[PDB]
Amino acid sequence: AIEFTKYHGLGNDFILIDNRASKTPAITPEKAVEMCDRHFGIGADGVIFALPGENGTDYTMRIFNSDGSEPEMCGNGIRCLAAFLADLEGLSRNKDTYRIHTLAGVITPQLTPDGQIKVDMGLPRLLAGEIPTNIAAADQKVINQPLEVEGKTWEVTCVSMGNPHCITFVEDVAAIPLETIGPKFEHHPAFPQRTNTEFIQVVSRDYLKMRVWERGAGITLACGTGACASLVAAVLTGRSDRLATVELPGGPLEIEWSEVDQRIYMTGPADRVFTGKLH
Amino acid sequence: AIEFTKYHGLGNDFILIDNRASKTPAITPEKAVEMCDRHFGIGADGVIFALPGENGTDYTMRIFNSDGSEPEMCGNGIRCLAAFLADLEGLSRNKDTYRIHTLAGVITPQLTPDGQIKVDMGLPRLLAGEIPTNIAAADQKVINQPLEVEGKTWEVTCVSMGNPHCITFVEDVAAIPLETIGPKFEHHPAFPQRTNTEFIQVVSRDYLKMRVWERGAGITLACGTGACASLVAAVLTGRSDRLATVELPGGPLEIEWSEVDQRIYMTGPADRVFTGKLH
Ligand SMILES: *C[C@](N)(CCC[C@H](N)C(=O)O)C(=O)O
Ligand SMILES: *C[C@](N)(CCC[C@H](N)C(=O)O)C(=O)O
Numbered sequence: 001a002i003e004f005t006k007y008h009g010l011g012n013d014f015i016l017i018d019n020r021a022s023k024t025p026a027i028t029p030e031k032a033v034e035m036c037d038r039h040f041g042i043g044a045d046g047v048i049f050a051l052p053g054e055n056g057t058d059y060t061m062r063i064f065n066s067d068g069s070e071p072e073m074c075g076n077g078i079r080c081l082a083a084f085l086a087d088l089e090g091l092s093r094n095k096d097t098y099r100i101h102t103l104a105g106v107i108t109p110q111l112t113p114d115g116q117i118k119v120d121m122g123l124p125r126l127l128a129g130e131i132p133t134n135i136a137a138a139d140q141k142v143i144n145q146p147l148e149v150e151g152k153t154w155e156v157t158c159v160s161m162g163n164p165h166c167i168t169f170v171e172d173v174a175a176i177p178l179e180t181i182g183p184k185f186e187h188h189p190a191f192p193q194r195t196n197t198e199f200i201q202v203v204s205r206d207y208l209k210m211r212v213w214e215r216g217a218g219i220t221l222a223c224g225t226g227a228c229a230s231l232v233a234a235v236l237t238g239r240s241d242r243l244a245t246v247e248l249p250g251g252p253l254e255i256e257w258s259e260v261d262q263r264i265y266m267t268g269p270a271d272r273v274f275t276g277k278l279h
Numbered sequence: 280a281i282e283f284t285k286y287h288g289l290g291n292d293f294i295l296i297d298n299r300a301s302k303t304p305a306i307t308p309e310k311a312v313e314m315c316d317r318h319f320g321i322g323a324d325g326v327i328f329a330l331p332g333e334n335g336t337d338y339t340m341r342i343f344n345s346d347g348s349e350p351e352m353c354g355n356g357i358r359c360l361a362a363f364l365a366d367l368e369g370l371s372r373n374k375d376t377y378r379i380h381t382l383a384g385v386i387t388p389q390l391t392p393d394g395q396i397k398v399d400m401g402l403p404r405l406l407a408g409e410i411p412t413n414i415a416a417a418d419q420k421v422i423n424q425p426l427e428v429e430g431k432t433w434e435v436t437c438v439s440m441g442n443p444h445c446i447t448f449v450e451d452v453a454a455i456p457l458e459t460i461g462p463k464f465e466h467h468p469a470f471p472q473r474t475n476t477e478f479i480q481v482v483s484r485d486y487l488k489m490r491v492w493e494r495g496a497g498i499t500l501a502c503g504t505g506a507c508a509s510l511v512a513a514v515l516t517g518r519s520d521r522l523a524t525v526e527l528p529g530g531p532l533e534i535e536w537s538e539v540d541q542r543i544y545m546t547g548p549a550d551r552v553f554t555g556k557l558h
Contacts, residue, residue, distance in 0.1 A: 006555075011318040039290040039500055039529070042553060043322040221318050250318070274321060276285075276555030 002027065004035075004042070005084060006273040009076030011221030011250030012045050013273075014063075016084045019049040023060075029068035035278075036066035042276065045217045048077045050085060057101040059085055065216030072103040073162035075224020075266050079117040082109035083270040104162025112267070121225070121264040124232045124257070125160040133158050133166075134190050143236050149184050157233040161264070164195040164215070165229035169239065173201040173211050182213025196223065198230045206244045208234060221250030228264045231255040281305065283321070284363060285552040288355030290500030290529030291324050292552075295363045298328040299338075308347035314557070315345035321555070324496045327356045329364060336380040338364055344495030351382035352441035354503015354532075354545050358396040361388035362549040383441020397546040400504070403511045403536070404439035412437050412445075413469050422515050428463050436512040440543070443474040443494070444508035448518060452480040452490050461492025475502065477509045485523045487513060500529035507543045510534040 005016045015035055019026055027035065032047040034040065044066060051060035061081050063074050078100060086093055097110040108120040125131070129138030135158065136142050142158035147166070157167045166185055170176060176199045185197035194215045201209040210230055212223045227246035234240030235257055242257040254267040284295045294314060298305055306314065311326040313319065323345060330339040340360050342353050357379060365372055376389040387399040404410070408417030414437065415421050421437035426445070436446045445464055449455060455478045464476035473494045480488040489509055491502045506525035513519035514536055521536040532547040 006321075008318060013318045038317055038322055039287055039292045040550075040552070042285075043317055271319075272558045273319070274555045274557050276553045278553045279551045 002278040003275070004278070005087075005275045006042065006044070007080035007084060007270060008250075008273060009079045009222060009224065009270050010248055010253065010268060012076040012223060013043075014077050014080050015042055015044045015047045016080060017047060017049045018088060019051045020088075023052055025049045025051070025062055029064050029070070032064040033066065033068045042278075045214070045220050046074065046077065048074070048081055050081060050088065054101040057099040057106055059098060060101040061107070062103070065214075067216040069216040070103075071163045071216065073107065073121075073225055075119060075121060075161070075228060076222055076268070077224075078102075078107055078109050078119055079224070079268055079270040082111060082117050083272065086111060087272070102162065116267050116269055118265060118267040119224075121161060121228050121266050123263055124229065125162075126232075126236070128158065131158045131160050131164045131195070132192055133164070133195070134192065141236075147185075147188065147190060149181065149188060157237055158195070159229040159232045159236075161225040161228050163225055164191060164193060165198060165226055166191070166195045167198045167200060167230050167233035169200050169202060169234075169237070171201065173199050173209050176211060178211055178213055178219055182219065186213060186215055196226050198223070198226045200230050200234065202234065202239050205239070205241045207247065208240060208244055209247045211249065222248040222253070224253060224266050224268065227253045227255055228266055232257060232264065281557040282554070283557070284554045285321065285323070286359035286363065286549060287529075287552060288358045288501060288503065288549050289527055289532065289547060291355040291502060292322075293356050293359050294321055294323045294326045295359060296326065296328050297363075297367055298330045299367070302331055304328050304330070304341060308343050308349065311343040312345065312347045324493070324499050325353065325356060327353070327360055329360060329367065333380045336378045336385060338377060339380040340386070341382075344493070345497075346495040348495045349382075350442050350495065352386065352400075352504055354398060354400060354440070354507060355501055355547070356503075357386055357388050357398055358503070358547055358549040361390060361396050362551065365390060366551070381441065391546070395546050395548055397544060398503070400440060400507050400543040400545050402542055403508065404441075405511075405515070407437065409439050410437045410443045410474070411471055412443065412474070413471070420515070426464075426467065426469060428460065428467060436516055437474075438508040438511045438515075440504040440507050442504055443470060443472060444477060444505055444512075445470070445474045446477045446479060446509050446512035448479050448481060448513075448516070450480065452478050452488050455490060457490055457492055457498055461498065465492060465494055475505050477502070477505045479509050479513065481513065481518050484518070484520045486526065487519060487523055488526045490528065501527040501532070503532060503545050503547065506532045506534055507545050511536060511543065
């Protein structure tokens, strides 16, 4: 009886639910796990609810990861949600931007003329207490710091986009055994709320290649918050400029850490795949 | 513009298409690959077409694997198709069994009172030429024969249920590195048309545990033709009786190699997950 629409942003794929009738998400986290199961359910990286606006915003977004946990933001999902909201509003839509309340703060996607969606992702949070991580003291940044993972010491940089990211720079990202090492970062004791983990190969100062092991979702084909965080980490470590393409397994995102307002802007696509109803 | 229903049989999941309007499948193999993609499409192990009957049968089944190739039969998919046909017929249904034309021959599912589907899967095909495989001469069976895969010699038995199977018996099926070794069996030169590969742990003479790397689909949670072939192989090698439970990752199937008619009967569930429409 549940109607939904399947979207993906660069192959990070989501079940979108019109939840305008209530501030309460209409499916539980447990049911979201069942719906995200790729064989027994619909199959997705997460469920996204289009919820009533709060505190002057146009709408609210909540998301459950495919493990049922509730993260604070999602960039690919915000793009999908903006596309979904435009589809719901149809010819009643009177603007090209939505102000969206999230657990991380207000996030503003803009539907651009060429079909892409450009998102004001807010300010990156750089202090260890904001990640959160215990690698450094709460009031310190975490830049090129050591993390021992199964006896091997990695150099990592942590950044939060509302959610935690642990970024490490590598010579050959395709060679990372991501299915094995990803969970060991995700659940490392240094991360009290777990972390997302990005492996970055710098191709040039404006082009990063990324693979990710996501908190609560595993190997995904793209991660918007993670691409933002990785660009921030590349700037902080002197490896990249503030405007770059981040090439993900599912395709490219354009990331800009603006010198005007110090906010991150992320531009990419959103694709509606199919509409469905649960039996 | 394509409407479809998602089903699974023990987690082996399929897109079912009502194709009774024409003998021409509504989608090409290339489009089936796109639709079976888990992140960019609907996500499935295969597309199954409910087609008009041929040569006296009630309906015809064709199936595309998620890689686009067209196999000759599918047991989990026949069960799902029988459930789909019963829904499509609705109150006009006047029988509990359908005779279904397939590339492998006529296959007859029976909707049983308890919600399961029992399928007459036909005679197993035991000669190397019928598999096909080059392990033995075309007129010989293939029972506990050697197969070198990356320099390690496995003992294998081959059986066809219309499609090829290569069965090997192991002490601990959970321990098989299936992602790594599966494709090496699938594409081994001994199999000119590739093969499905089943790893079997005998628990008792009426209980087998199975994991499978499918031709054209990879790691699946269940395979009906493969469970049938594995029971046949277990009988041929003296390891099991002719009636057994085959426990797959997705659940159990009941397999019987009847002594009355030497045909294989397979019983298991079918579950309708959701209906949908491509954007
Ligand atoms: C949607 C996402 N890939 C972030 C999803 C949340 C993370 N899995 C987490 O738990 O923080 C994105 O595109 O940003
Ligand atoms: C549906 C299936 N798992 C068989 C599907 C065909 C094989 N992948 C092949 O290529 O032979 C079943 O349940 O029998």
